[model samples]
Target: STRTETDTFGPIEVASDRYWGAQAQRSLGNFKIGWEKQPLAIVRALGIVKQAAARANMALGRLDPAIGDAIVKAAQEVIDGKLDEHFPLVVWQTGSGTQSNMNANEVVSNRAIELLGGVMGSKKPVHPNDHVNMSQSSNDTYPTAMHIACAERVIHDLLPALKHLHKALEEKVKAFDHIIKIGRTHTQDATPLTLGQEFSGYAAQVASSIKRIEMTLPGLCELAQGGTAVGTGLNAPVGFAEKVAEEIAAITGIGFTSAPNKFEALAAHDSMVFSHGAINATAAALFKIANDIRFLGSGPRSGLGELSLPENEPKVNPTQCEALTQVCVQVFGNHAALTFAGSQGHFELNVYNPLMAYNFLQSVQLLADAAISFTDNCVVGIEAREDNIKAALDRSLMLVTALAPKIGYDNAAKIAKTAHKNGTTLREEAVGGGYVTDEEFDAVVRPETMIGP
Candidate 1:
């Protein structure tokens, strides 16, 4: 007997009680590779696209409102796991997400037909191309879907995770405010600094990343949803561009603004490239901090034994400590450049001297703007915050104003000089200068501040 598992995809009647494709459901046999499961971001993105399709159909005055409503309800069900039967197996169909989208169309249309008491895949009650997938072409829709999905993930999930991590680092800076430790620059020892100060710098980096991410949203918001054929909106109705934006925004709780020029939004994948650059920045920061912690904690008998870390790492450090071996692994990927002007990272740079050119450029502009604002408002024009500087001070033997007389002006100047040149702790420099003992300096100066966010 022909049997089927009914889902949002429809009755999906198959030959006999077993569908051959059902075997693909089992974990790792024939499809012996690929990333684990389908990215949930892709799923969420598809849901947003599907919602837009229904809304566009309604606004175009091309289909019955009831049918559009039914299709939407069915698509929601699909998003909620009712369409699993149709989207079974990994989407290795193509590098792009076209197949996954078509899968959505097939499943949703058939389900809507089933809801209307029609045969599976019959197109009797609802046509996939003529009605359900109306006002959309795969080319424009694919990139639009990617942008919507990425922005949603960044805002809803990624940013929240980052914020939590940043908060943890802030708490650490407070807790370890006075712990002294040696600072490093260009892999050479520098003067004394606080562990807390280091963490403060880490926190500042995260804060900066959040601002950068937020800045990219306007471009991402300009999606080409109604760009039906080559961004011309050929088959789409006049008001579809506006209505679809409203509906998707309502459904996803994301601010989905309309595209001013569908042609540019469709033809170019600039938003994706921009997003990739953000990812690269995050990766760079994470890797730098993680590697630094591992290096500081390397061999208690040797290495830069500065501030000791706690059991629960503030950041995502691995169980095994990373070897402090320095090697500039080439960043083997295409990424967008977040410069003041248009994008810029299409070329490659030397591994030894990778200048954060775009970031530096951004910093210059921000600093200049803040300087102007400070002059106008009479506020201090400090770029690095107090906490950040203090945290930098914790991991050292540098003498404070109170201890200046004890160390002597000549000796203090010598310590600062040593710190500037060799990156060694002031305490180490003090002991070498026959002025103070390492134990005495450690007893007075704090080290916890150096182990920063």
Candidate 2:
């Protein structure tokens, strides 16, 4: 069943059972681009904003305490995810995300109306635009919600997941600290390194990536609320911005502050773009780590055969590599969308708010999920193939590197070429070629010594 509701765009039909009104109905009918709904975190963040707004309005004596209390209670249900199903519109709505913002406004208002014994979509005792939206504009609140959602997720989810991954890798490094292995450069044998040393490098990469992500958080925490439609704080109350930020901080346990320059905050998304770049960098790091692990674990039977990985059904590397690569590709696409959206905005408003909001959260989420999965299923359980390591090291002509300094480069090159030509170890060629005596060969060509210096 459907009923008609009047907006600035005139009467539109909305489903009778829904808490949402005309604008949400219009958007649902107009934009059918993707199956993804507006991110739930953003929805919940918007709920927080409404709850704070209700309290702020009440404190300012702008609203009846009973009505404000009702709105706050309804909005809290949204924050608790009790009202999520009412947010039916996707991210592909209006460019300013006015429709989505209005979607939130309508849902909260109607739910509040229900609490006060008014009909859903009645717009009577609790109106969507005048009461729920209050002094806020979609222009400010949408971007503010974006900032809040991203900041909360990064601090609570992605950062912790990254720390877990780093810890797992660090543990593996210590566990493999005594396992010596052949190292490669340019896909050919180069030298020797403890398996621990290689794992440590991966751990260091994750640590640096974590710091980069952390650096972006302060920017995300500075939200664009209080900047009404034109960045002039036109209709918002004097202390609305500060109070809202304080309320959000108290609710989320993550600090937030209003932007100093409302004009720049409304017009551009530099903070989100910077954070997207950091996420891209983290994705690249994970991609490198996952690829290296896949290569090392390539073949328990035929490939590098140096590391043993957790096998899933038919193949070992397939699940880990495919999952990691898919995450990387998704991050790339999400970043590209963010870059495009964040760049193409006009003078006083970034019309690409929904796109930037969607992609930024998506990138952060995928990287976090992938990091946790890789750490648990792959990195923690890795084992070195000691026999393969020894065989590969024994055959590598690069071992002559240790002996090269002792014998002249000319003689060392000949010994290496001879070892390659004849099916013999460097020990056989170096000793038999008379470049060094057996005791001298043992002392100078030690692979462990070749590991460093």
Candidate 3:
């Protein structure tokens, strides 16, 4: 059931059905810290890097055509996620993700050998280091793959999800625009605002988050490939970085470019830090939106109840908002890991590649997916409950704001305080306190007038 594969360290037996070789088996045995596997996004991205590199090498005459062709074919299968099981490293491996990078090379080379009519682990037709890896080192490839994976996920998964949520929020904004409800400041009723105007806040926040997240693409698009060992570009061909970037961009349809300064690119993951910071900002916005939605839709009998959240059953709470709340916190939590890992990079290398990749990618996925559910399940069918809106609106004493300009600030204050004390209406208190007549109070104390000016 097991077959032996030999590396410089020693020969080890991996499962007969597995395409992975000695280095991968060594990594699997050495790093068993957590149940986490290298995310499939990262695995596929590494495959993309290898494929692009192989083609670049072939174009530049750095690799033999027959060998390069096989590597490309095998790498494509990895990109398609056909060999995901062969990549058996976890996120807790070497901080540089060296083992995982080698894992990619070994699996691709073995498969490439098999494709070229050679036995697996023969190192014939396609040696893992000589042909498949071509002119790369773990230092460069891992970070390159990290950026590619991060950018692709943000564009393909996260952005689309946010846009979906944004559309739903906008729909709610338009539909709820006419219902005047009490606006709360410090959790106390302050003034009147249309329900649509309140939902507009959520819409604007999502729109802003979308913009911020997109702004990070330029940095993410600058890949750290071809930097080689110390970003010196040693052994790699003259135009390898630029040509491979072009190849990658062609495959992905995303305009990725070689980093202008590989030293900076390889040494610091500042781009990811900046990017995740934006993601965390969105999480903060979502947290507030979720909390506000839940509070507004709290209870039909005892809570704010200004809005009715749709549910599978009548007694359902704001489950979507609650789910989104947890999603936001996890996004927020991810930023802490990213910030530290991104900051910990020293003068020549940052050693937290896999961990940062996992954290950053998870935040995007959670935010993107949770936003979708919140949009569909909670936000879309939200009801304004005009009866509740009017009742809350009718009880708001902030309408006295309009009376201040005409009745004097001191008199308006007394009327508001006395109205609250006596459980009377603002109009009754103002007229009873002799500050204004019924007609004057009606004209000046209008809630609608107080809404804007």
Candidate 4:
């Protein structure tokens, strides 16, 4: 049922059916942490990185063509999701993600060995280190895969969802263009603006967050693959980094490039930190947008009641917005984790790679899904409660704001106070107090006029 495998660390027993070797077995026994495993996207990205390295090694004559071809074939299977079961290591394994790197190495080497008609655990036709991981180290490959996975998710998933939310808000802005509503400042009524204008502000926030995310891609594209072991390219070929990056770019169509400063790339995770900061900013924007929408769509009777939203059918605006706020808190917490990990870089390598990868990927996924949900459940179906909006506006003592320039500020304040005390309208108070004629009150106190100049 189990076979013994040996690495430099010593011998370990692995299940016969498992493709992982001594290193992965050791890690599994050593780190019995939580059940949270690395994401499949990271596993697939490791495959892509390994395949690219194999191809580059083959091109440089560093690896035998047949062995390189076999490794590529196995790694491709990984990319295609055929080898997901082989990568069962937890995210809590090693801070540098070395165990995960070795998991990929062992799986690819054994699978390639099987392809070449060799024994499964034997370091025969394909060697995990001498061949499969010829020009890379976990220090470099782990962070490189982190960048690749996060970048692809941001571009392919997060940005598109945000754009969908933005489009929905834009449509709502047009739909609510003519409905004037009382605007609030510091939880008190201030002036008036068309409901369209309010929705337009939300749309602009999403547009800006999208731009921020897009801006982080260039830094994310720089990978640390060539800085094997420490920060130096000790055992790797001279042009290995450039060629591997080029190969990965071709395979992923993502424009990946080798890091300009290998030392810095290996020693720090500033790129991931900065990218997650952008995502965190997007979360903050979404929290504000969602909360604003929720506040406006509060109730049919008890709350603001200014906007009519979908019923509380479990997937409507209120629940969606509340979910989004919770996601914002989650993203913020993840950002804090990223910051702690990012700043813990020692002399040659950062020891927080796994934590950073876990949080960064999680934040990207949560925000992406939240954006799509908010667009579908909240923004698109939103409708202005025009009757409630008008009634609220008609009762707001702040409507005296428009007449302040014509009458004095002193008189406007007096009119507002009198209207509030008597439970009458500001228009009635201003007209009855002889500060304005009926026609003057009609022209000056209009909500539409109070919206803007």
Q: Per-residue lDDT tens digits of candidate 3, residues 160-188?
A: 99999899999988888777777788787
Q: After superposition, how far is residue 222 of candidate 2 from its true place, in Å?
A: 0.9
Q: Which residues of candidate 1, in runs, are more than 4 Å off?
A: 1-38, 81-85, 88-96, 307-453
**Candidate 4's error at 415, in angstroms?**
3.4
Native-to-model Cα distance after best TM-score fit, residue 53 in candidate 4, in Å: 0.4
Write the residue-wise lDDT of candidate 2 on 1-453 in tens digits: 887777887998777888889888888879988888999999999998888888878887788887788889989999999989889988888888788889889999988998999877678788999888997999998888889899988998899999999999999889988888778889877678999999999999999999999998889899788888989898999988888888888888887988889998989999999998999999998999889888888876788988889886663654776798789889998998898888898999989988888888888888898899888888888888898888887877777777778888888888878888897888899888777899998888776665666
Candidate 3 RMSD to the real structure: 2.1
Model 1, residue 47: displacement in angstroms? 2.5
> Which structure among the candidates has the greatest TM-score?
2
Candidates 1 and 4 compared: the better one by TM-score is 4
Query: What TM-score would every model get versus the actual structure?
Result: 0.67, 0.96, 0.94, 0.94
> Model 2 off-target regions past 4 Å?
2-4, 8-13, 405-407, 434-437
The TM-score of predicted model 1 comes to: 0.67
Worst 10 residues of 2 by lDDT: 312-321
Write down the worst ten-residue block by lDDT for model 4: 308-317
Tens digits of per-residue lDDT, candidate 4, 145-230, equal 99989998898999999999999999989999999887889988777889999889999999999999899899999999899989
Residue 445 error, candidate 3, Å: 4.2
Predicted structure 4: lDDT: 0.89
What local distance difference test score does each model get? 0.55, 0.87, 0.89, 0.89
